Design an enzyme around this catalytic site. Structure first.
Site, PDB file in Angstrom:
ATOM      1  N   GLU F  51     -10.331   5.015   4.147  1.00 37.31           N
ATOM      2  CA  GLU F  51      -9.746   5.741   3.030  1.00 37.31           C
ATOM      3  C   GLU F  51      -9.420   4.786   1.901  1.00 37.31           C
ATOM      4  O   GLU F  51      -9.728   5.056   0.744  1.00 37.31           O
ATOM      5  CB  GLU F  51      -8.493   6.489   3.468  1.00 37.31           C
ATOM      6  CG  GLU F  51      -7.717   7.142   2.338  1.00 37.31           C
ATOM      7  CD  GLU F  51      -6.720   6.200   1.688  1.00 37.31           C
ATOM      8  OE1 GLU F  51      -6.519   5.088   2.214  1.00 37.31           O
ATOM      9  OE2 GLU F  51      -6.137   6.577   0.652  1.00 37.31           O
ATOM     10  N   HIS F  52      -8.813   3.659   2.239  1.00 39.58           N
ATOM     11  CA  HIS F  52      -8.476   2.686   1.222  1.00 39.58           C
ATOM     12  C   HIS F  52      -9.724   2.254   0.481  1.00 39.58           C
ATOM     13  O   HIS F  52      -9.721   2.181  -0.741  1.00 39.58           O
ATOM     14  CB  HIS F  52      -7.803   1.485   1.852  1.00 39.58           C
ATOM     15  CG  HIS F  52      -6.363   1.709   2.180  1.00 39.58           C
ATOM     16  ND1 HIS F  52      -5.946   2.667   3.078  1.00 39.58           N
ATOM     17  CD2 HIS F  52      -5.241   1.097   1.733  1.00 39.58           C
ATOM     18  CE1 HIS F  52      -4.628   2.640   3.164  1.00 39.58           C
ATOM     19  NE2 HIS F  52      -4.176   1.693   2.363  1.00 39.58           N
ATOM     20  N   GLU F 125       1.128  -4.044   2.913  1.00 39.07           N
ATOM     21  CA  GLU F 125       1.981  -2.885   2.932  1.00 39.07           C
ATOM     22  C   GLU F 125       2.544  -2.783   4.329  1.00 39.07           C
ATOM     23  O   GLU F 125       3.717  -2.508   4.506  1.00 39.07           O
ATOM     24  CB  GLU F 125       1.225  -1.620   2.544  1.00 39.07           C
ATOM     25  CG  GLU F 125       0.231  -1.117   3.571  1.00 39.07           C
ATOM     26  CD  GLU F 125      -0.515   0.112   3.100  1.00 39.07           C
ATOM     27  OE1 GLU F 125      -0.163   0.646   2.028  1.00 39.07           O
ATOM     28  OE2 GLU F 125      -1.452   0.545   3.799  1.00 39.07           O
TER      29      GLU F 125
END
Lengths: 418, 28, 97, 38, 24, 394, 43
Positions: F51-52, F125
């Site tokens: 997705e990233h 993150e």
């Protein structure tokens, strides 16, 4: 069907859609935000918002809570500085007692001293939690360091005023700022007929116009807050257009040209002239956007930056320089067309939900007493033209600025350097 | 501790929100 | 009957110790709630009167007869509030069943 | 007692009845094995 | 973070399925 | 009166579901039956990583080109990944369906895999994802409840895998778990079903889990507040009793005492998460266990009603908006295989009474061994015997 | 599995099964032991 807005002679305007949708929503819109407060009642509004559950002259707090809960209905009290709205949501069958509860709350608070007293501890929290996102603190400080009297009043109660707000003051506000002519009852899920038949009873009572609306005066300035956060937040704004002008449309097109939030998750929001102008020079993580908040007498437009403390300076400078380029006519017509498409898509997705639709109708009612079909707006936004955008820009780049900064501000510039 | 604690930068004015329902917060 | 009330009043003599009627109501939970809501002035006053009585009782003495709270003088401060508290408990109870 | 007079209150009891009998029943049989009455 | 490692194996402990729970 | 949720299928097997509504914009999304449950511990962060990397670069569009265009159209591009489903959806003006659909086609196929940077993004993150205590608690309530299964592992994966991932691996996950029969093209709002079906034909036409009663306790006394989640085995996604369990949650509704019914394919977690100062954790737990027990043996029609009504006002609908609805269309076609209408939900709600609610609550909550996950000052959090003994009444 | 769901899961029933079982177990225990004692001591 369509809303039919009708101004009962009491001044209240009634409007409904009766979409026959399952869960009808009805909301009263009353101009009663902090704006309408003054220096010695700072906080009344905040408590009023959290005190939708105090015994009403007609119902016990207990019934209020239990009743609304039982029917599954929900009463919420949103509030901006420019205004405030109470909203009830629920099954079409239970909305009669939901309107009973909501109209009792809006038109008859007992504000029992013991009860209000029990809430001041709950007040600390709200003002407190809402400040988790530094942004809140900033926007607040900003509207404050920017204005002198009216829009400088905070949405959340100050620390010294907790323990000092009394029932009397609250009652004072309602009877003063919460009058009929300053209110409007829009309902989605009901019959326009009944709204008139349930407002003609409670709302038409407070017939007067109400306390005068304190005008707002710009002051400029800058307030900073060194608190050792990892990221520096900085908002730099200037005076802009108010509600009811085409220059407000020009400023909305200007923020959608400069950048008004990412459209792609994990995107870099490539187009944002600001984001591009920062990203061509700084490889640190950042978040640069355009801020616009317009109220019925005055508006604030500017830039909002989050960045690493070290780069905080030139990033802000880069963002400022980009706006100066727009003030010099350095823009393309395709960019303005994309900004208009972004603004109109944002408006349509804001009104596509039921509570957003009810809020919009509500706001329009209090603001202009009229409903503007989504279509009408589309052609007015289209009216804004390239030069118009440029114009608003020069207003920002020239007008005295107001700056709210927070974080490790050792490399954050000042206004005379900015 | 802000009771029960939880980056997107604000670009629009704030709007407090509280009421009978348990959720309560602010949006830009 | 009212005359009889006054007689009972004297006989009760709570007037002697210098206390109003609401002063003597046993602090049942319900009573407790109402007491709390009392505007502070009254609460502090209530305390003074109650404490005085305690001191007087300790010394086995009663205030000057004149100082005795006259039946007529006696007013009901806690009661107005108490009524609400009771009604409140009542409301909760049936919503309960 | 006034509060005990409630329809739901009644429903709760009705739902609670069987269990009550059981414990009493166990106790009953228990008393038997407990004493062996004669 | 909290996902770097997985719950340690208890196979030498774990027995060898609500079907079984009732019995267990 | 009520939308139809007209749904069809195509050669590939991709389904094309839509629910026309008078709102003006639309939320067109692609759902995929692919999550962390389909990963085999050697590619534990492939879906998240994809997705990233996705939404950023493609075959017909280079780099920002898609992101750049969607901005150009004025649409909001979002994506999310769970343990079972992945969603890529666009909120956009209905008229833009033509491009809202072609763009989505690129995102699912012809995508171009930046990998280095996204790795860093995810990793960093994650280094901070520890700040989301609640997510932590809920990703252990998963680890300790589904020990040894692919449902224990998180969506993000362990930093290890994140660092150790390559295009080919990703390519595999992409080429393995992005099959056309496991895909739903869902549209909600101002869309025509025939036009959306023609666009899907033109583009996109090319495409034993076990619950283990256990406990994980992460003690860190420097944190100001403690988060504790207690769950039992949820029935599932398709199990009918889910609805009688939702009503039970609506009956329950110390601090932040939320309640959850997370459902996966014939499994799930049903329970409560609460954050409290350490000193009160035990009292909270006692409180909470008493309540579950209340429903199990002492429900009341009145309260059930309270619960049925709150559930009634939770059902998602055109009013909630396009995205909420799309999202429901995508999950309904992935999980149930059909879109359950709100009238069927209302029928299943009104058939619920107090007797079957306490029967279903005794079936699940009563006596089953829970999964407990605590984080913070959790010394006064009771150990497993006290919680297990609180799972029944003498 | 049936037993658990029937007499060992509800604590009240748990007690019932215990008490009833104990009521019978004793007499038997006494008998068995007594008998054994007797077989063990034949006189």
């Amino acid at each position: 069907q369509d809303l039919e807005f009708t101004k009962l002679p009491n001044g209240l305007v009634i409007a409904s859609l009766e979409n026959y949708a399952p869960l009808s929503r009805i909301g009263l819109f009353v101009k009663a935000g902090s704006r309408y407060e003054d220096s010695n009642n700072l906080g009344t509004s905040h408590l009023l918002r959290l005190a939708s559950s105090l015994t009403t002259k007609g119902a016990s707090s207990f019934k209020i809570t239990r009743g609304i809960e039982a029917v599954g209905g929900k009463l919420s009290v949103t509030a901006t500085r420019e205004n405030m709205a109470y909203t009830v949501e629920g099954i079409r069958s239970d909305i009669e007692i939901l309107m009973e509860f909501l109209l009792n709350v809006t038109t008859a608070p007992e504000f029992r001293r013991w009860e209000v007293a029990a809430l001041r501890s709950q007040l600390k929290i709200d003002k407190a939690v809402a400040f988790q996102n530094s942004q809140t603190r900033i926007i607040e400080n900003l509207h404050d360091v920017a204005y002198k009297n009216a829009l400088a009043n905070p949405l959340y109660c100050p620390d010294y005023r907790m323990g000092k707000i009394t029932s009397e003051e609250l009652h004072y506000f309602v009877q003063n700022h919460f009058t009929s002519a300053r209110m409007a009852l829009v309902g989605l899920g009901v019959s326009h007929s009944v709204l008139k038949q349930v407002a003609e009873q409670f709302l038409n009572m407070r017939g007067g116009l109400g306390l005068a609306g304190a005008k707002a005066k710009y002051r400029g300035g800058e307030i900073r807050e060194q608190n050792g956060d990892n990221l520096v937040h900085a908002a730099i704004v200037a005076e802009s257009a108010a509600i009811g002008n085409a220059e407000a449309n020009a400023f909305s097109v200007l923020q959608h040209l400069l950048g008004a939030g990412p459209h792609i998750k994990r995107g870099n929001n490539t187009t944002s002239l600001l984001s591009q102008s920062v990203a061509k020079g700084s490889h640190q993580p950042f978040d640069v956007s355009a801020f616009n908040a317009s109220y019925s007498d005055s508006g604030l437009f500017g830039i909002y930056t989050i960045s690493q403390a070290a780069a905080a300076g030139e990033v802000i400078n880069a963002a400022y320089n980009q706006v100066k380029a727009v003030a010099q006519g350095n823009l393309s017509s395709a960019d303005v067309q994309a900004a208009k498409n972004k603004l109109k898509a944002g408006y349509l997705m804001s009104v596509e939900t039921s509570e957003g639709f009810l809020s919009e109708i509500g706001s329009q009612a209090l603001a202009a007493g009229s409903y503007m079909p989504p279509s009408t707006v589309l052609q007015q936004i289209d009216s804004v033209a390239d030069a118009d955008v440029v114009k608003a820009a020069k207003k920002f780049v020239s007008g005295k600025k107001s700056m709210a900064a927070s974080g490790n501000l050792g490399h954050t510039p000042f206004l005379d350097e900015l | 501790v802000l009771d029960v604690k939880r980056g997107q930068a604000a670009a629009r004015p704030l709007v407090a929100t509280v009421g009978l329902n348990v959720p309560a917060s602010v949006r830009f | 009957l009212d005359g009889f009330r006054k007689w009972y009043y004297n006989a009760a003599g709570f007037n002697k110790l210098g206390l109003m009627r609401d002063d003597t109501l046993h602090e049942t939970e319900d009573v407790k709630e109402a007491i709390r809501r009392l505007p502070e002035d009254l609460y502090n006053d209530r305390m003074f009167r109650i404490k005085r009585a305690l001191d007087l009782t300790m010394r086995h003495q009663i205030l000057p007869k004149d100082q005795w709270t006259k039946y007529e003088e006696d007013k009901f401060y806690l009661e107005p509030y108490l009524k609400e508290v009771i009604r409140e408990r009542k409301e909760r109870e049936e919503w309960a069943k | 007692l006034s509060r005990f007079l409630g329809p739901r209150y009644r429903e709760l009891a009705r739902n609670w009845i069987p269990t009550a009998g059981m414990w009493g029943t166990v106790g009953a049989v228990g008393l038997v094995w407990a004493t062996d009455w004669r | 973070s909290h996902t770097d490692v997985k719950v340690p194996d208890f196979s030498d402990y774990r027995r060898a399925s609500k079907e079984s729970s009732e019995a267990r | 009166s009520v939308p139809e949720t007209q749904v069809s299928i195509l050669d590939n097997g991709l389904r094309v579901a839509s629910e026309q509504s008078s709102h003006a914009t639309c939320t067109v999304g692609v759902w995929i039956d692919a999550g962390s449950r389909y990963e085999t511990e050697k590619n534990n962060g492939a879906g998240y990583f994809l997705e990233h990397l996705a939404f950023k670069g493609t075959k017909n569009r280079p780099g920002n080109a898609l992101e750049k265009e969607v901005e150009s159209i004025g649409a909001h591009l979002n994506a999310y990944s769970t343990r079972e489903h992945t969603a890529y959806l666009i909120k956009a003006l209905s008229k833009d369906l033509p491009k809202v659909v072609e763009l989505l086609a690129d995102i699912v196929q012809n995508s171009s895999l930046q990998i280095e940077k996204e790795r860093d993004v995810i990793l960093r993150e994650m280094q901070e994802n520890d700040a989301s205590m609640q997510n932590v608690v809920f990703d252990y309530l998963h680890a300790t409840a589904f020990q040894g299964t692919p449902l224990a592992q998180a969506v993000e994966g362990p930093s290890e895998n994140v660092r150790r991932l390559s295009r080919t691996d990703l390519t595999d996950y992409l080429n393995r778990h992005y099959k056309a029969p496991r895909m739903v093209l869902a549209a909600a709002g101002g869309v025509e079903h025939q036009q959306l079906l023609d666009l899907a034909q033109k583009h996109l036409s090319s495409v034993p889990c076990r619950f283990t009663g256990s406990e994980i306790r992460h003690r860190d006394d420097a944190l100001p507040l403690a988060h504790v989640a207690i769950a039992v085995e949820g029935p599932g996604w398709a199990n009918p009793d889910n609805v009688t369990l939702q009503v039970a949650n609506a009956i329950i509704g110390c601090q932040s005492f939320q309640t959850f019914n997370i459902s996966y394919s014939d499994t799930g977690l049903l329970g409560a998460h609460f954050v409290c100062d350490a000193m009160s954790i035990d009292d909270m737990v006692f409180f909470l266990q008493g309540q579950w027990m209340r429903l199990c043996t002492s429900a009341t029609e009145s309260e059930v009603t309270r619960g049925k009504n709150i559930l009634r006002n939770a059902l998602v609908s055109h009013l909630d908006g396009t995205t909420p609805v799309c999202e429901d269309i995508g999950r309904s076609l992935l999980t149930y295989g059909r879109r359950i209408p709100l009238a069927e939900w209302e029928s299943r709600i009104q058939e619920v009474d107090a007797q079957m609610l306490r029967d279903i609550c005794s079936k699940y909550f009563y006596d089953q061994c829970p999964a407990v996950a605590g984080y913070g000052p959790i010394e006064q959090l009771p150990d497993y015997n006290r919680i297990r003994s609180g799972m029944f009444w003498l | 599995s049936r037993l658990y769901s029937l007499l060992f899961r509800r604590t009240s029933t748990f007690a019932l099964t215990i008490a009833v079982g104990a009521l019978f177990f004793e007499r038997a225990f006494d008998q068995g032991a007594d008998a054994i004692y007797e077989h063990i001591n034949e006189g």
